[PDB]
Amino acid sequence: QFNPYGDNGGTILGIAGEDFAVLAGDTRNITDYSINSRYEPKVFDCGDNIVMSANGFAADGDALVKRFKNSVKWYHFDHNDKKLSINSAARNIQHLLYGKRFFPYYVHTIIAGLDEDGKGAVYSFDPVGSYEREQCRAGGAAASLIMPFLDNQVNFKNQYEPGTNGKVKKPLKYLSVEEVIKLVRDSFTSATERHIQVGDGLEILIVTKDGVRKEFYELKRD
């Protein structure tokens, strides 16, 4: 019988700073034990300072990003070129996903940008459109490898203040863009070593009030 779903592998990572946000993804596209491409981007500038990735089944991912980019276009036409706030974009994507509740888009979605106070925002979705704002989120194949590391190194979980008998927690603070990109690069090199579907290349999209900048870094090709 025909199976309408597939797994194109890959893994994505969103981190929110004080006055910035990053959305990272590996550039490897796979089916089973074959490499389809070593450079196939799945992190996209959608306009209005919103970056988006739909990781999982690439066909469903491309379809959703295409539909959302179109949703941004028609929001401008229908509401006098008004800027689509990240919170509004998130709710719109919930409806796009829940629209196919009984034939889901098999993807994990993460959008990054700035909220209306200019502070870094990351939203993560399930396949059928349940969503939540988060400081930190990894998605896709190697999510299970990256996410606990980010709990430790971003949210300082299970870290206490030396000499306080584990009574005083290590204080939460915003990380610089330089410190965040280090954690992203290490997160992906670590995932590349232990996950066969992750490697080839890492593409990071950084969102500030100035706009959307790109950085590329080579990963192991085995």
């Binding site: 606990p148 590391f149 430790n152 299970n158 670590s190 995932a191």
Partner: protein, 204 residues
Amino acid sequence: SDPSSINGGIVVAMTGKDCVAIACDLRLGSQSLGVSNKFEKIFHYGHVFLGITGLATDVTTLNEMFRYKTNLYKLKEERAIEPETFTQLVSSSLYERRFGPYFVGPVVAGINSKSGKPFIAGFDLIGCIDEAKDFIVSGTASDQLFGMCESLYEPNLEPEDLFETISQALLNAADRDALSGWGAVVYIIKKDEVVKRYLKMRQD
């Protein structure tokens, strides 16, 4: 009905400078229900440490089995078994049950009493040996432990430092697994002293 994830739990082992560390969670459950928060998964036969994850009946049975085998070894050989040799005995004993296996993920840690070389090894349920310089991971949060270890770990860590690294590797992995946690134990193993520390962690 997957034996390896009924009871749940995790083991991790790491090498440092003239030392090894092995750590486990304390949870035993029946799927969703937490039953015991005092179920240690790390046993020692002389100076050789064995951690076992998987079906809890097989964890208990294999502990009793390797105690039996190492007791007879010591009586005949007139010396404690070494890690390298014990590794081969675990492998032999598991592959004997090739078509009716013990649903377990054993981990060997210890220092060779002659050479002083730190030694760790992992196995699958049918006794394939994974010998590794850096670290070994086992259990329901193995994916999580692989991520933590591969990013946190660096070579030639001192005992006091290695303790922090393995502790943070286990605690953060367990907190992202539903069937792991409910307390944790870390063994720091030097050539001629062994410290055992119970970690404070979230009880959910």
